[PDB]
Design a binder for this molecule. Structure first.
Ligand SMILES: [Zn+2]
Ligand SMILES: [Zn+2]
Ligand SMILES: [Zn+2]
Ligand SMILES: [Zn+2]
Lengths: 343, 337
């Protein structure tokens, strides 16, 4: 059985949630990845050093004995955020990056951004101190068709922002379109992107033909096949400013399989082997390690991990569900037979 | 306050299911509509006169005393259907129409059923079409449009006297196609495809109760459908595609397609016509255009809608599970008096 040995990977885009759900889901990340970028979209969000320090410790408390795992914390950008708080957290090694969610005029200033123009002082501060900006690049305006939201972000927000702040380092998180793949391919050394396993493995048909599949519902929404193919081609090319970010985003089963299902795939348990399957299919396994273990560190100016893990091409069955305190979590590819797993 | 009186409507596209579900859902149709086209996609499908006659009795058994409702039965077309079976059922008054479902027991090509279609054309039986292609690599949002080009237009060029209803049209492509067609081409439109677009199903959460086939399209398609009905074009008519499933078959890891809209469809169409400043065309959509296309008389009774806000029930009881109606828990602007 074929063996794939790689430097220990990292996850450059992760949701760990909090409380009991955090206790459940952390082990699936800590058992495999050395570090992860931990997103700040708690309720309430992580917008202060104190909260990030506290949250970091809750994460560390939940790491099983012996796992070598370091959470890399983020600040949720809001209109009200003091640039000095951000800077202090970056300087103290508490915030590795800050995250910009979609703007909306009606958002409370404690919970997000009304527009990019309103948070120039903080963005300028990030440019100054060399702090990376992580972007969920969709516009939210009600008239705009959901499938166009990412492309429209590129024209309306990302390009003007990058033209404004020429030294700002930006990660275009979880890209899902040819439009984004091309934009990132054609960008400079200050622009990178992450790609999830579901956006490489699937397109909107897998979510909507023969049934509606809420466990494949996530944001940005799965796009038509031509976009999926662009993404696969981008990672297969060896392009070195794209890297692993799972966007593992767990919700209890009853919240996914409801009359209004929550967005997000719980893909931490199965992402890495899914990535391996994609790179193999694209005849590009030579570029798999870099994607998983080198490109991200290089973009963030952090060291590459010096231990190794092995995947083995031996069929395993994914769990049907994973028990929480009250309900259950359905993992990405639940109940399926997968091609690659971790040894 | 505002009351709108209309000729009693008919539903030219309905799923009544069978067994306990049939018992629950029929009265929501029979209390309002004089007739309905009862689709044949049972399991197993209705592909014979005997099966159609039995199903029709099960339907009548479940109609409350005092409702004047006539189910109009259909044959489920299959590759191997005997044209004699279809015709006999038409001549006996059992089959009003035949329904073409592209496979995925459905039909795998128009060419495999040409003898059936030629007979239908001969005898003057209308063909009802679920107009989507199904090839795996064709994007779901394109399947209706591709069907027009690859299947519908070549079919109608080959059988120029065949009467065809393009069921539940969902696109500008279909709307223009039907608007520019001849007197042998008509269409039905559902309330959901007038009221909503794909953003309503997908933004801020995934909403399985708005998941139906053909899939809700982009807003420009929705607007084309609204403009078509509002124009007074007389070969579009009411067909709900009420397509009920138990709550937890909708709210699952793989939710079934279909909106249970019988309870709320008539009022929802009223809202759409009002919104388009086209209430003068509402009666004809509901109660005249379908009968004209099918060669049937219009109903000779009337009903009233009243513009008084009612809440739609959060659910409806079944023997097993519940049934969530279209617009459940929502306020609706018009209701039947
Ligand atoms: Zn995101
Ligand atoms: Zn995320
Ligand atoms: Zn249909
Ligand atoms: Zn139908």
């Amino acid at each position: 059985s074929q063996v794939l040995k790689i430097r220990r990977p990292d996850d450059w885009h992760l949701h760990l949630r909090d409380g009991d759900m955090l206790k459940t889901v952390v082990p699936y990340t800590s058992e495999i990845y050395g570090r992860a970028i931990v997103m700040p979209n708690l309720a309430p969000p992580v917008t202060t050093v104190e909260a990030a320090v506290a949250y970091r410790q809750r994460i560390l408390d939940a790491v099983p004995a012996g796992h070598d795992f370091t959470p890399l914390m983020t600040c949720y950008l809001t209109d009200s955020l003091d640039p000095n708080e951000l800077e202090r957290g970056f300087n103290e090694g508490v915030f590795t990056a800050a995250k910009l969610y979609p703007a909306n005029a009606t958002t409370n200033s404690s919970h997000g951004v009304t527009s990019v123009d309103a948070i120039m002082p903080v963005l300028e501060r990030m440019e100054k101190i060399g702090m990376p900006l992580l972007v969920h690049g969709e516009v939210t305006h009600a008239d705009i068709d959901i499938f166009d939201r990412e492309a429209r972000f590129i024209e309306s927000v990302m390009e003007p922002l990058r033209q404004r702040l020429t030294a700002l380092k930006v990660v275009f998180e979880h890209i899902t379109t040819k439009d984004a793949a091309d934009y990132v391919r054609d960008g400079n050394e200050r622009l990178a992107a992450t790609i999830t396993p579901q956006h490489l493995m699937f397109n909107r048909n897998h979510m909507l033909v023969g049934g509606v599949r809420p466990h494949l519902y996530c944001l940005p929404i799965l796009k038509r096949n031509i976009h999926q193919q662009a993404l696969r081609e981008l990672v297969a090319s060896g392009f070195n400013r794209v890297f692993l970010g799972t966007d593992s985003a767990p919700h209890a089963r009853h919240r996914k399989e409801s009359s209004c299902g929550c967005a997000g795939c719980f893909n931490a348990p199965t992402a890495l082997g899914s990535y391996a399957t994609v790179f193999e299919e694209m005849n590009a396994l030579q570029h798999f390690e870099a994607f998983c273990s080198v490109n991200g560190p290089q973009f963030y100016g952090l060291p590459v991990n010096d231990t190794f893990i092995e995947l083995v091409r031996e069929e395993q069955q994914v769990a049907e569900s994973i028990a929480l305190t009250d309900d259950t979590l359905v993992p990405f590819l639940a109940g399926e037979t997968v091609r690659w797993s971790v040894k």
